[PDB]
DNA sequence: ACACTAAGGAAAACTTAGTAA
DNA sequence: TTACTAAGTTTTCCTTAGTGT
């Protein structure tokens, strides 16, 4: 996991390294302990808690591992778009 | 990380588990073992060996990690595209 | 060649109990 | 409050050594 990506999408979101563990699931005990270690990469969180993690922070988990600076807004970006936006990305891909 | 994405890439690629396993640095004597605990979901690799696996399947590592199927073909799709293709779409999410 | 699995030491994550701006 | 960390404990993985096609 990509701990840049975790600070990033966890900045714009508003929240504390431990508000993020505890919204996404964590034992309130060992929170704040965990949430820093995955963002000062000291350890990797698995892909359940990421998926959980990216629920929270409202971007699609794979962003989290995405290093193409350009893919990952990209995907930040095909987050947000609306049915007919999408509509016309998918015909564009196919 | 997704079993179901490493296996269709793999297919793709139309490589073993093994020879996947060689090319992507892991030692001949436990190779065909590893990649099979990953394609079964027995064990996940960590991140350094995703992106090992990305690069000899010629993918985005973003891939192995996107559960979206539509997003999963964007990034598959975006994969192939060349350094002016991708300024088009930079510009587009800009 | 190719897909696959149990077992047990190797190694990594999780928990506890904190300190430091 | 929020960020951070060491050391202990528990969990998961890598390697070995086989299975079967």
Same mark, same amino acid.
């Given at each position: 996991m990509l701990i840049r990506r975790l600070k990033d999408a966890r900045l714009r979101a508003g929240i504390s390294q431990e508000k993020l563990g505890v919204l996404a699931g964590i034992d #309130?005990?060992?929170?704040?302990?965990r949430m820093n270690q995955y963002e000062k990469g000291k350890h990797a969180?698995?892909?359940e808690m990421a998926n959980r993690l990216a629920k929270v922070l409202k971007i699609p988990v794979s962003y989290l591992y995405t290093? #193409?600076?350009?893919l990952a807004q990209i995907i930040l970006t095909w987050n947000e778009l609306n049915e007919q936006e999408r509509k016309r990305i998918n015909f564009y891909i196919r």
């Open positions: #309130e005990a060992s929170a704040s302990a969180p698995d892909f290093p #193409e600076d350009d």
